Protein backbone atom coordinates (compact mmCIF):
# COMPACT_ATOMS: atom_id res chain seq x y z
CA UNK A 1 0.00 0.00 0.00
CA UNK A 2 1.43 3.83 -0.39
CA UNK A 3 3.03 4.82 2.53
CA UNK A 4 2.74 8.76 4.37
CA UNK A 5 5.27 11.52 3.52
CA UNK A 6 5.19 14.88 5.11
CA UNK A 7 7.36 17.40 5.61
CA UNK A 8 9.75 16.13 8.57
CA UNK A 9 9.87 19.36 11.41
CA UNK A 10 6.35 18.88 11.72
CA UNK A 11 5.63 16.81 15.28
CA UNK A 12 1.94 14.41 15.95
CA UNK A 13 0.47 16.73 18.69
CA UNK A 14 -2.90 14.80 18.58
CA UNK A 15 -3.91 11.26 16.82
CA UNK A 16 -1.59 9.13 14.81
CA UNK A 17 0.10 9.36 11.39
CA UNK A 18 -1.58 5.90 10.73
CA UNK A 19 -4.92 7.27 11.24
CA UNK A 20 -4.10 9.38 7.74
CA UNK A 21 -4.26 5.88 5.56
CA UNK A 22 -6.99 4.23 7.75
CA UNK A 23 -10.16 4.73 4.97
CA UNK A 24 -11.92 6.65 7.87
CA UNK A 25 -13.00 10.37 7.69
CA UNK A 26 -13.50 10.52 11.30
CA UNK A 27 -9.67 9.75 12.23
CA UNK A 28 -7.06 12.36 11.99
CA UNK A 29 -3.89 13.76 13.00
CA UNK A 30 -2.77 17.44 14.29
CA UNK A 31 0.81 18.27 13.58
CA UNK A 32 2.04 21.32 15.34
CA UNK A 33 4.10 23.37 12.98
CA UNK A 34 7.94 25.05 14.20
CA UNK A 35 9.18 28.12 13.02
CA UNK A 36 7.01 30.10 15.69
CA UNK A 37 3.72 27.57 14.63
CA UNK A 38 4.07 28.28 11.06
CA UNK A 39 4.08 26.24 8.25
CA UNK A 40 6.17 27.63 5.10
CA UNK A 41 4.89 27.70 1.55
CA UNK A 42 6.89 24.62 0.28
CA UNK A 43 5.93 22.09 3.25
CA UNK A 44 3.84 19.19 2.03
CA UNK A 45 2.16 15.28 3.19
CA UNK A 46 1.12 13.22 0.81
CA UNK A 47 2.07 9.34 -0.49
CA UNK A 48 5.13 7.65 -2.12
CA UNK A 49 3.20 4.87 -4.11
CA UNK A 50 6.22 2.53 -3.82
CA UNK A 51 6.59 2.53 -8.06
CA UNK A 52 5.38 4.20 -10.86
CA UNK A 53 1.34 3.51 -11.23
CA UNK A 54 -1.01 4.82 -13.77
CA UNK A 55 -3.73 6.89 -10.96
CA UNK A 56 -6.97 8.05 -12.07
CA UNK A 57 -7.26 10.64 -9.15
CA UNK A 58 -7.04 11.13 -5.66
CA UNK A 59 -9.69 11.88 -2.38
CA UNK A 60 -7.65 13.48 0.41
CA UNK A 61 -9.21 15.21 3.55
CA UNK A 62 -7.42 18.23 4.89
CA UNK A 63 -8.72 19.39 8.47
CA UNK A 64 -10.30 18.10 10.62
CA UNK A 65 -13.26 18.08 13.57
CA UNK A 66 -12.98 19.58 17.11
CA UNK A 67 -9.22 20.34 17.94
CA UNK A 68 -7.41 22.05 15.10
CA UNK A 69 -10.33 22.03 12.64
CA UNK A 70 -9.74 25.78 11.97
CA UNK A 71 -5.65 24.54 11.08
CA UNK A 72 -5.35 24.21 7.20
CA UNK A 73 -3.71 25.59 4.38
CA UNK A 74 -5.35 28.79 2.80
CA UNK A 75 -3.14 28.49 -0.42
CA UNK A 76 -2.00 24.91 -1.92
CA UNK A 77 -1.20 22.89 -4.50
CA UNK A 78 -1.62 19.51 -5.84
CA UNK A 79 1.83 17.76 -7.26
CA UNK A 80 3.56 14.79 -8.71
CA UNK A 81 7.31 12.82 -9.14
CA UNK A 82 8.59 10.14 -10.59
CA UNK A 83 11.95 10.74 -8.54
CA UNK A 84 10.78 12.87 -5.06
CA UNK A 85 12.95 15.53 -6.74
CA UNK A 86 10.81 17.00 -9.75
CA UNK A 87 7.41 17.89 -9.58
CA UNK A 88 4.38 18.50 -11.80
CA UNK A 89 1.56 20.90 -10.73
CA UNK A 90 -1.79 19.04 -11.19
CA UNK A 91 -3.84 22.00 -9.73
CA UNK A 92 -3.56 24.85 -7.57
CA UNK A 93 -6.08 25.76 -4.55
CA UNK A 94 -7.02 29.42 -2.72
CA UNK A 95 -9.31 27.97 -0.09
CA UNK A 96 -8.96 31.66 2.48
CA UNK A 97 -10.98 32.21 4.74
CA UNK A 98 -13.20 28.82 4.10
CA UNK A 99 -15.09 27.24 7.06
CA UNK A 100 -12.98 25.68 9.62
CA UNK A 101 -13.25 21.52 9.23
CA UNK A 102 -13.10 18.01 7.18
CA UNK A 103 -12.36 19.29 3.60
CA UNK A 104 -12.59 16.79 1.15
CA UNK A 105 -10.22 17.41 -2.28
CA UNK A 106 -11.12 14.73 -4.66
CA UNK A 107 -10.05 14.46 -8.12
CA UNK A 108 -10.59 12.42 -11.41
CA UNK A 109 -8.12 12.53 -13.98
CA UNK A 110 -9.48 12.17 -17.59
CA UNK A 111 -6.12 10.97 -18.91
CA UNK A 112 -4.73 9.25 -15.86
CA UNK A 113 -1.30 10.29 -14.62
CA UNK A 114 1.72 8.48 -14.04
CA UNK A 115 3.45 9.05 -9.96
CA UNK A 116 5.56 7.30 -7.75
CA UNK A 117 4.88 10.10 -5.03
CA UNK A 118 1.59 12.71 -5.06
CA UNK A 119 1.08 15.03 -2.03
CA UNK A 120 -0.50 18.57 -1.79
CA UNK A 121 1.88 21.40 -1.10
CA UNK A 122 1.56 24.63 0.99
CA UNK A 123 2.00 27.52 -1.37
CA UNK A 124 1.87 30.31 1.39
CA UNK A 125 3.03 31.13 5.09
CA UNK A 126 0.18 30.27 7.50
CA UNK A 127 0.83 31.03 11.43
CA UNK A 128 -1.44 27.94 12.04
CA UNK A 129 -0.46 24.09 12.98
CA UNK A 130 -2.16 21.54 10.73
CA UNK A 131 -4.77 18.56 10.88
CA UNK A 132 -5.71 16.30 8.29
CA UNK A 133 -7.88 13.16 8.17
CA UNK A 134 -7.16 11.10 4.80
CA UNK A 135 -4.98 10.17 1.99
CA UNK A 136 -6.38 7.77 -0.64
CA UNK A 137 -5.61 7.39 -4.46
CA UNK A 138 -8.01 5.80 -7.33
CA UNK A 139 -5.93 3.20 -9.74
C1 LIG B 1 -0.10 23.30 23.21
C2 LIG B 1 -0.35 24.76 23.03
O1 LIG B 1 -1.35 25.30 23.45
N1 LIG B 1 0.60 25.39 22.35
C3 LIG B 1 0.68 26.81 22.05
C4 LIG B 1 0.47 27.21 20.58
O2 LIG B 1 -0.90 26.93 20.19
C5 LIG B 1 -1.07 26.77 18.78
O3 LIG B 1 -0.97 27.98 18.04
C6 LIG B 1 -1.12 27.81 16.65
C7 LIG B 1 -0.97 29.18 16.06
O4 LIG B 1 -1.98 29.99 16.62
C8 LIG B 1 -2.51 27.20 16.34
O5 LIG B 1 -2.67 27.00 14.97
C9 LIG B 1 -2.68 25.88 17.08
O6 LIG B 1 -3.99 25.36 16.88
C10 LIG B 1 -2.40 26.10 18.57
N2 LIG B 1 -2.42 24.84 19.28
C11 LIG B 1 -3.25 24.60 20.29
C12 LIG B 1 -3.24 23.21 20.85
O7 LIG B 1 -4.00 25.47 20.75
C13 LIG B 1 0.84 28.70 20.40
O8 LIG B 1 -0.19 29.55 20.93
C14 LIG B 1 2.22 29.01 21.01
C15 LIG B 1 2.62 30.48 20.96
O9 LIG B 1 1.61 31.18 21.68
O10 LIG B 1 2.27 28.59 22.37
C16 LIG B 1 2.09 27.18 22.46
O11 LIG B 1 2.21 26.81 23.82
CA1 LIG C 1 -8.54 8.85 8.69
Redesign the pocket.
Known amino acids: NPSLIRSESWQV?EGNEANLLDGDDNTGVWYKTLNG?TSLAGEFIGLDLGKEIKLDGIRFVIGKNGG?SS?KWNKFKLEYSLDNESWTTIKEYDKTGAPAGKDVIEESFETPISAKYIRLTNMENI???LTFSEFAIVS
Open positions: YDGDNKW
